[PDB]
C-alpha cells in the first residue's frame with residue numbers, strides 16, 4: 001500500500017512508496033508495536049548480491065544494460081565458484097554511502113552523499129588497522145573542520161577471521177569502578193576499560209582518559225595502540241557567562257566515530273567499518289553529561305548555579321540542562337571544532353526528508369531516535385510523522401567481540 | 408509468548424504477557440513501523456462475543472468468574488442482544504469499564520491514578536439541556552475549587568448511529584480561535600474551525616485572546632445546541648513568573664480543568680460517543696505545547712525578547728531557555744493558586760512505578776513511548792529510557808470523526 005506521512009505543524013503531506021522495497025522485518029506485528037525497543041549460503045547470497053547490483057546499475061542509469069547484465073553474471077559465477085564475491089570500488093563507495101542514507105536512526109543524513117570512503121580491504125594486521133584508523137582520524141578531524149568518512153576493513157569469510165574494532169567509538173573516555181562503589185570517568189565504558197587493563201593498558205585512572213584502540217585482524221587476538229594524542233582533538237568546556245563552569249573540569253572529544261557496527265552491502269558483511277561525521281550538541285550535553293547513568297552532572301551544575309533543588313517543580317534540572325548545552329555548543333564553536341545544535345540539525349533533516357520523498361519516494365526514519373532528547377516539541381521533527389522500515393545496504397548492531405572471541 | 412521490556416538506565420527488565428489479550432490492530436506490520444503516525448452500528452453477530460469477553464473480564468476482576476451470577480448475566484445479555492440487538496450495562500459494569508478504558512489508554516502518562524475515577528452515569532439523559540446540566544455538574548465536581556478530582560460523565564450509548572449523543576467541543580473548556588483577514592490568528596489557532604461553527608450557530612464571540620468557548624451539545628442525533636458554562640464554574644489561572652515580574656504582563660492565563668470531550672468509549676462492544684472525562688494537567692501540556700507550539704499560541708519570541716536573550720543564532724539555545732522559564736511560570740502559578748497540577752519529572756517518575764506495578768499485577772501495561780515522553784527535557788525523565796510495548800486493549804477510548812463532518816442536519 002502507499003502510505004502517507006503528515007507533519008502536524010505545516011500540514012505538509014508526503015506519500016511513501018520506498019517502503020515497498022523493504023525486505024527485512026521491523027520487529028512489530030499487527031498486534032504489537034515495538035517502536036521503542038532499542039534492539040528488536042551461496043543460495044542466500046546471490047539474491048542479495050542481485051538486489052544490490054540492480055539498484056546500483058539503476059542509480060547509474062544503466063539498468064538492463066549489457067554492463068549491468070555482464071556484472072550480474074560475473075558475480076554470479078564468482079559466488080558459485082568462491083562462495084563469495086568482491087565488490088568493485090565503485091560499488092563499495094555506493095554501498096557505504098547508501099547504508100548511511102538508509103540509517104533510519106541518523107538525523108544528519110542530509111550529508112549522506114558527501115562521505116569519504118577509505119578502502120582498507122587490503123589490510124592484514126592489527127598494526128595495519130591502527131595505521132588506517134590513524135589516517136581516518138586525521139583526515140576526518142581536519143584540524144576541527146570535520147569531514148565525514150568511513151574506513152572499510154576486509155569482509156567476513158568464514159566468520160573465524162573477522163576484522164573487529166573492539167572499541168564502541170574510535171575515541172571514548174575510560175570508566176573505572178572505585179571503592180566508594182562510585183564510578184570514575186564514563187560509566188558506559190567500564191567493561192571495555194577493564195578489558196584493556198586485563199590486556200595490558202596502563203590506566204591513568206582519570207576522569208577523561210582517552211581509551212586505547214583494541215584492534216582485531218583476521219580473527220587473531222586484539223592488540224592495543226595509543227592514538228597519537230596530537231590526533232585526538234578535545235574541547236575544554238566553558239560557559240559564555242558562568243566563569244565557574246570551567247572549574248567543573250569538563251571536556252569532550254570533537255570526533256564521534258562509531259566503530260562496532262556491521263556494514264552489509266550486497267550480502268557481504270563488513271564487521272569492521274568505523275565511520276564518523278560530527279556531533280549534534282545534545283549528544284554530549286544531554287546524554288553524555290546528564291544521563292543518570294553517564295557523567296550525571298546535573299546535581300553538581302545545579303549546585304554551582306545556586307537554585308532550589310528542593311522541589312522537582314522548580315525545574316532546576318531543566319534550567320541546568322539548557323545551560324550545560326549552551327556551554328557545549330559555545331566551547332566547540334569557540335575552538336572552531338565542527339558541531340551542530342539540535343535546532344539546525346532537525347531543520348536540516350526535515351529538508352532532507354522532503355528531498356528524499358520526492359527524489360527517492362521516501363525516507364525511513366525512527367522517530368524515537370530522531371527527536372532530540374531535550375526540547376523535543378520545539379524542534380520540527382517532533383511534529384513530523386515518520387515511517388520506520390529497513391533497507392539495505394545497512395549498518396547493524398553486532399555482538400561485542402569479547403562475548404564471541406575464541407582466544 | 409513472553410516479551411521482554413528493558414529500562415536502559417536501571418537495567419530492570421520486565422516481562423509482558425498482557426499483550427496476548429490484544430485483539431485490535433496497531434497499524435504496524437512485520438515490514439513497517441507506524442509508531443509515530445498520529446492516527447493510523449455493530450451487528451448482533453460481532454456483539455455478543457465482545458460482550459462475553461468483557462463480562463468474563465469483569466467477573467474475573469471481582470473474583471466471581473464461573474459463578475451463577477456470572478453465567479446468568481451472560482445468558483441475560485445474549486437474550487437481550489438477540490431480542491433487542493443491543494444491551495444495557497449494569498452500573499457496576501459501566502464503572503469498571505470506564506476505569507479500564509483509562510487504564511488501557513496507552514498514550515496516558517497519568518494512569519497511576521486510574522482506579523480513582525468518579526463515574527457519572529448520564530445514560531438517562533435525553534436532551535441537550537440535559538447534557539448541559541450534566542456537564543456543569545461534572546465541571547463543578549471535578550474542579551472542586553482547585554483541588555481537582557478525576558471524573559467522566561457517560562451519556563447514552565450509540566444505537567442505530569442516527570441518534571448519537573455528541574459533545575462537539577474537543578475539551579469541555581477551551582479558548583476560542585479567530586482567523587483574521589490579514590491571515591494572523593487571534594486566540595488559540597487549534598480551535599479556529601470549531602469557533603467558526605459556534606459563531607455560525609449563534610455564538611456572540613467576544614473576539615479576545617482567551618474567550619472560553621460555548622458548549623455545542625448534540626443529544627439523540629438532533630442538531631447541536633449552544634450553552635455558556637457559568638463563568639463561576641470555569642477556574643482559570645493567570646500566569647506569572649516567580650522571578651520575572653514582567654511575565655504577568657504577557658497577559659497569559661489558562662483554564663485549570665483539562666476535559667477531553669470528543670473521544671469514543673468502547674465497553675463490551677457498546678459505543679459511548681459522548682463521554683467527557685477530566686483529571687488534571689501535567690505542566691508541559693500548557694507550557695510546552697499550548698504556549699510554544701508554532702501552531703498554537705507560539706509565545707517563544709515575545710518571551711525570549713523580554714529576557715533579552717541572544718536570538719541571532721539558534722545555538723544560543725534562546726528558545727530552550729525561554730521554554731524552561733515559561734514552564735516554570737505555569738507550574739508556579741497553578742501551585743500559588745492552589746490548583747492541582749503535576750510537573751513532568753513527578754508525573755513520569757510515577758508512571759514508571761505504575762508501569763512496574765502493572766507488569767507485576769496484570770502482566771503488562773500497553774504504553775505509547777512517542778506520547779509518554781514529555782515534549783521537553785525528554786531524556787532527563789525516566790520514561791525516555793524505558794522500553795515500552797504498545798498494543799490495544801478494550802475497554803478503550805478511541806478517536807472518532809469530528810461531528811460536523813458526519814452529522815445529518817435537520
Ligand code: HEM
Pocket residue numbers: 100103105106107108109111115148149150258275276277278279280283340345395
Ligand atoms: C555529519 C554528521 C552527522 C550527524 C550530526 C549525525 C547525527 C546523529 C545522531 C544525533 C545520532 C544519534 C546518536 C545516539 O543517540 O547515539 C546518529 C546516529 C547514527 N548515525 Fe548519524 N550523524 C552524522 C554522521 C553519520 C555518518 C557519517 C554515518 C555513517 C556513515 C552515520 C550513521 C548513523 C547510524 C548508523 C546511527 C545509529 C547509531 C546507533 O544506533 O547507535 N551518522 N547520527
Ligand code: HEM
Pocket residue numbers: 508509512514515516517518520524557558559684685686687688689692749754778804
Ligand atoms: C490525573 C490526571 C491525568 C494526567 C496528569 C494525565 C496526563 C496526560 C497527558 C500528558 C496526556 C497527553 C495529552 C496530549 O499530549 O495531548 C494524556 C493522554 C491521555 N489521557 Fe491522561 N491524564 C490524566 C487523567 C486522565 C483521565 C481521567 C483519563 C481518562 C479517564 C485520561 C485519558 C487519556 C487519554 C485517552 C489520552 C490520549 C488523548 C489523545 O489521544 O488525544 N487521562 N494524559
Ligand SMILES: N=C(NCCC[C@@H](NC(=O)[C@H](N)CCCCN)C(N)=O)NN(O)O
Pocket residue numbers: 039168169256257258259275276277278279280283397398
Ligand atoms: N554524531 C554521530 N553519532 C552516532 C553516535 C552513536 C552512539 N551510539 C550509542 O551510544 C548506542 N547507545 C550504542 C548501542 C548499541 C547496541 N549494541 C555511539 N556509538 O557512541 N555520528 N557521527 O559519526 O557523526
Ligand SMILES: N=C(NCCC[C@@H](NC(=O)[C@H](N)CCCCN)C(N)=O)NN(O)O
Pocket residue numbers: 446577578665666667668684685686687688689692806807
Ligand atoms: N491531562 C489530560 N490530558 C489529555 C489532553 C488531550 C488533548 N489531546 C489533543 O489535543 C490531541 N492533539 C487531539 C488529537 C485528536 C485527533 N482526532 C486534548 N484534547 O485536549 N487529561 N486529563 O487530565 O483528563
Ligand SMILES: C[C@H](O)[C@H](O)[C@H]1CNc2nc(N)[nH]c(=O)c2N1
Pocket residue numbers: 035036037038368369370415791792793794795
Ligand atoms: C527505550 C528507548 O528506546 C531508548 O531510551 C532510546 C530512546 N531514544 C533514543 N534516541 C537517540 N538518538 N539515542 C538513544 O540512545 C535513544 N535511546
Ligand SMILES: C[C@H](O)[C@H](O)[C@H]1CNc2nc(N)[nH]c(=O)c2N1
Pocket residue numbers: 008382383384385386443444445777778779
Ligand atoms: C508526529 C508525531 O506522532 C506527533 O507530533 C506526536 C508526538 N508525540 C506526542 N505526544 C503527546 N503527548 N502529544 C502529542 O500531541 C504528540 N504528537
Ligand SMILES: OC[C@@H](O)[C@@H](O)[C@H](O)[C@H](O)CO
Pocket residue numbers: 167168188189190191192193260400
Ligand atoms: O564498556 C563496554 C561497553 O561500551 C560495550 O559493551 C557497549 O555497550 C557495546 O559495544 C554497544 O555499544
Ligand SMILES: OC[C@@H](O)[C@@H](O)[C@H](O)[C@H](O)CO
Pocket residue numbers: 576577597598599600601602669809
Ligand atoms: O477547531 C476544531 C478543532 O479543535 C478540532 O478539529 C480538533 O482538532 C478535533 O476535535 C480533535 O481534538
Ligand SMILES: [Zn+2]
Pocket residue numbers: 028029032033034035435439440441442
Ligand atoms: Zn511499530
